Amino acid sequence: KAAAERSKMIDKNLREDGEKAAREVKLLLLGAGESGKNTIVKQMTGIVETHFTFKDLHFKMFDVGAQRSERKKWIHCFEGVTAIIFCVALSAYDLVLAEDEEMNRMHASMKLFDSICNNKWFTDTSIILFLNKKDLFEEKITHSPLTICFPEYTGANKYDEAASYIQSKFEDLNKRKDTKEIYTHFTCSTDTKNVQFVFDAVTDVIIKNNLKDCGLF
């Protein structure tokens, strides 16, 4: 039968494509508008795909954010990503939203993080959280003391205290702390070790995934 032979060749093609496509990482770079995600893209129109090999590991990155539609209808397509590369610019704490111009960017970003972290599709998905443009954030925090953005701060305007407070706020609102790991990293515009942090973080993610698959955890 020629049709049976064609179907067997097609099935061989499909299983080879699966064997060469189950070894990829499939990162979901879901950041926020003007939050320095493009910088992460350069150091590596509804979905933008970036493919790069680091240390003989293949990474596929879904630069989502240009959709501008209701997120409840298309986010479940990304169920099964290794991690969510949530990108926030620290220096944008005092920056104003372009859409609304009356409500702060950190409040919008933590609202987005509360929405993304607390959903059915990412119950067991780690969030690699990059904090972009810290090399502008030290000057902005010497000028603006973060008091207007966070009334509940009760602290000084030092770089370390403000950065740790923002990292604590981002690791806050993770209601399901047992399964989701907020791998937080501090990066500049000129930082070049972001791909190394991504490699190490997804190595920890796949090790924890193998622990749960083997039942050791």
């Binding site: 064609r6 099935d11 093609n13 509804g46 959709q67 501008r68 209701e70 209808k73 397509c77």
Partner: protein, 306 residues
Amino acid sequence: NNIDPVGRIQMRTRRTLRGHLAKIYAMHWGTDSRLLVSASQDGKLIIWDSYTTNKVHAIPLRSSWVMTCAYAPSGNYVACGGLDNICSIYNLKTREGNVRVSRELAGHTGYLSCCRFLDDNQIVTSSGDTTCALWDIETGQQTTTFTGHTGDVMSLSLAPDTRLFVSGACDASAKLWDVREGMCRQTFTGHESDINAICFFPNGNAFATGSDDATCRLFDLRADQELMTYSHDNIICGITSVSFSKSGRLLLAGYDDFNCNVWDALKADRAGVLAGHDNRVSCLGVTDDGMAVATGSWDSFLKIWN
């Protein structure tokens, strides 16, 4: 009601199709009634030989994020939308010996929720940017754009005459679009939640809207109001897919409760339960000759029921 209910529907999985390695989001039954199309997140679009459980074609999708699918009534082309906003039309029968993409319609801003062919070279699509659009294949340009929805148009269904169609949005409203006019004949806003699925009756004078509030509300074009509301206290989940039988008695409805609950067109009684899928039944369709009903679910399984 004076009608006689058919009763319990004993309908079995005769054919199951495997070869998908990721969740299936859309299916469409061809007019030839033998060839099936399945679209999944693996990046592979499969033309299935449904009767012999064979794979006619494996199409390497450029965008793996495909949320809708359509198979041409002539059986020559196949269309896929999705998150990349590009409706890709592929040539199944090629002289060179390999499947090739024919056209890449890129004029939608939102993701392509549903695409359906009117003719061989005309396709209507709906997107999450509050718009539907009729397109020419050979031109690659929108023939027209249907606007008027204030929410993301999630579901699109074509009448058998392919002259009128209806679209349901996340605004909890379904509008009757004329293809030629592009002017809203009527608006049905009895729903409370987003219309996830929609399907015309084979008469063409009625259509079922499977919203996410577990009510497959059936509307009639000439009646101007609602006829029946399919609300069951047991079911609380959303209605992922909606289809009809040829007589339209069985309002097939894929559900988020992992099962396909068959309904009664005239008495709103759940004539069957079809729990044979591990994951959510994403896509559901009757065969055009009514011979079988195929459901594809997120467990990468396409099952044919006779």
